């Protein structure tokens, strides 16, 4: 109890003091990169100690060490509702970023702002930990905005770059719209209810709660880069891959989902709200993946792969399966983080290049990357006995085995199919094929941390899924009875992608001509959403401002 409580919050307080070393003290120059990483190393180990107690004893304490304000009839405090989500999730973010931190030392070797980066990288982790452990909206909101500030700076890391400045703002602009739903909950609860801490809402259990959830859906949209608020996520890849991997492919864009899990009790009751969530998740996953099949730069495909995966994460919320959505995000966090790191090997290998039309033949030149890029994609593809299967298979069974909307439900089968369609392109174009890389080739991965970092993540993509799926508590019903074609429709339809995709891959070498397809230009340009929106609205506000 007391050990569980103390060890719950030691991790966060462990991280803070290193930051103080940048204001005070000049103790240790020229070691900050390695120095900072080890905190995340120790953070994961210590954080697991409550987890192991949490698993065995199911101890979900609430800790409010300091009171910060009290207004008339509403009382604020710095509360820590140690619950299911953070106890299991936090270790994932800690270790998933562990590889990134150690890897980032070599990736950003030439940058004089490496200390600033390491300083700033941890600062984002600070936001998420309090954000995830936040027991109240106000405490939650502070982190809910904190990531955005770090999100902007880390997106616009190369402040000289013209697009990076806009790109970070572009993320911001959508992010601002997200909080609008958030505050509505804050306003709705104080207005209707009389408190913001998550406890009392679940205590009162509102009978009629339609409006605040709409805000949650809207607020989740902004942070989930969903359809309608998607265009910003692709533009955030201008930053360093660790920025993209750590934030926009592992945890940052999943916060919108995170809260929805935190507020599972309310969304579930009104199935209409569940219906609302499915419509966004259904339309988003189909569109996000659909554009990925065309884009040239690998990082663009990677970003949409998370975007399409994000759809399933929301979709699970639309079916009243909270802890399962939690699983997919964590399982997704296991490997999708690795992929961008592995793709970084391609980026660094080709001297900072991403276009796959100058890539190929790295199977023998970079087998280790081919040994690491392939592994993660298998779980993404839905391959059995992988971290994706331990959730995709289990969740996909719930996709068609519960009261659903047929038109929206069909969007689920396509989504899984399109998930693997692009995967063969990356491997074929980048790894296999004839050598398309330029004449001066600098294929040399002779860096220790890269090798070490790739090792550690490869463990998670494989072993974790069975461990977690065989170690998580029972919080729902095991839905195992269903027709076999419905049982593994993902397996039935996932392979169909291979058949058509492989046909396309063979059609790549064939010396046949190129045809401009309306389903290609529309899907290649991202369905006109960025270009039309990035040129219509900006004129209106500025042009009409003078009036």
């Amino acid at each position: 109890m007391n050990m569980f409580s103390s060890l719950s919050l030691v991790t966060l307080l462990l991280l803070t003091m290193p930051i103080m070393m940048m204001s005070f003290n000049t103790y240790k120059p020229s070691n900050y990169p390695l120095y900072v990483k080890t905190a995340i190393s120790y953070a994961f180990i210590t954080s697991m100690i409550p987890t192991m107690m949490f698993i065995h004893s199911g101890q979900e304490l609430i800790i409010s060490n300091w009171h910060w304000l009290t207004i008339q009839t509403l009382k604020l405090s710095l509360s820590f509702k140690m619950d299911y989500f953070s106890m299991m999730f936090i270790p994932v973010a800690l270790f998933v970023t562990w590889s990134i931190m150690e890897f980032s030392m070599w990736y950003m070797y030439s940058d004089p702002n490496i200390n600033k980066f390491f300083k700033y990288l941890l600062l984002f982790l600070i936001t998420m930990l309090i954000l995830v452990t936040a027991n109240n909206l106000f405490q939650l909101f502070i982190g809910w905005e904190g990531v955005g500030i770090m999100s902007f700076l880390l997106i616009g890391w190369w402040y000289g770059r013209a697009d990076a400045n806009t790109a970070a703002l572009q993320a911001i602009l959508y992010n601002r719209i997200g909080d609008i739903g958030f505050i509505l909950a804050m306003a709705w609860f104080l207005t209707n209810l009389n408190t913001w801490d998550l406890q009392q809402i679940f205590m009162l259990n509102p009978s009629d709660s339609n409006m605040p959830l709409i805000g949650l859906a809207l607020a989740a949209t902004g942070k989930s880069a969903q359809f309608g608020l998607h265009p910003w996520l692709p533009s955030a890849m201008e930053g360093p891959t660790p920025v993209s991997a750590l934030l926009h492919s592992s945890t940052m864009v999943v916060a919108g989902i995170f809260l929805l899990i935190r507020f599972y009790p309310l969304t579930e009751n009104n199935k209409y709200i569940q219906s609302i969530t499915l419509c966004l998740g259904a339309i988003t996953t189909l569109f996000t993946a659909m554009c990925a099949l065309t884009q040239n730069d690998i990082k663009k495909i990677i970003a949409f792969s998370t975007s399409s995966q994000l759809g399933l994460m929301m979709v699970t919320i639309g079916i009243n399966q909270p802890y399962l959505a939690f699983l997919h995000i964590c399982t997704h966090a296991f490997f999708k983080a690795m992929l961008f790191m592995c793709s970084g090997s391609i980026i660094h290998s080709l001297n900072d290049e991403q276009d796959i039309r100058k890539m190929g033949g790295l199977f023998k030149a970079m087998p280790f990357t081919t040994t690491a890029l392939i592994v993660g994609s298998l779980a993404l593809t839905g391959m059995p006995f992988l971290t994706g299967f331990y959730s995709k298979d289990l969740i996909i069974e719930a996709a068609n085995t519960s009261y659903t909307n047929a038109w929206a439900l069909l969007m689920t089968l396509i989504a899984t199919s399109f998930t693997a369609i692009y995967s063969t392109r990356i491997i074929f174009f980048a790894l296999l094929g004839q050598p398309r890389f330029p004449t001066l080739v600098n294929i040399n991965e002779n860096n220790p941390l890269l090798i070490n970092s790739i090792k550690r993540l490869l463990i998670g993509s494989l072993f974790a899924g069975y461990i977690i799926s065989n170690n998580i508590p029972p919080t729902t019903i095991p839905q195992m009875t269903m027709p076999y074609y419905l049982k593994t429709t993902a397996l039935i339809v996932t392979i169909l992608g291979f058949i058509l995709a492989l046909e396309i891959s063979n059609m790549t070498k064939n010396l046949k001509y190129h045809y401009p397809s309306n389903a290609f230009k529309f899907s290649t340009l991202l369905g006109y959403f960025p270009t039309i929106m990035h040129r219509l609205a900006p004129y209106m506000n500025l042009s009409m401002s003078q009036k």
Partner: protein, 88 residues
């Protein structure tokens, strides 16, 4: 980027091999002062292919005008080094 530095002399032999990989460029007619239009007999169409080959040989794009004025290897050598800040 580890440390692959470049030298003024080094670019010269690179230029020739790109000029050696040109089938039309006879090895015995390949020289630093070999004017493309005159000494090598290579017209604008031929020159662009070399510049396109050069662009893939150095990982930097040459603008439209900077590929026209290069009608001999020396200009290219006088041009590549100036672009890539090569001093030694």
């Amino acid at each position: 980027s580890d440390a692959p530095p470049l030298t003024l002399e080094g670019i010269k032999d690179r230029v020739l091999y790109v000029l050696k990989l040109y089938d039309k460029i006879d090895p015995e007619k390949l020289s630093v002062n070999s004017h493309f239009m005159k000494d090598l007999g290579l017209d604008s169409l031929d020159q662009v292919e070399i510049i396109m080959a050069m662009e893939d040989e150095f990982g930097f794009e040459i603008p439209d005008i900077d590929a026209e004025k290069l009608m001999c290897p020396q200009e290219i050598v006088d041009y590549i080094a100036d672009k890539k800040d090569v001093y030694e």
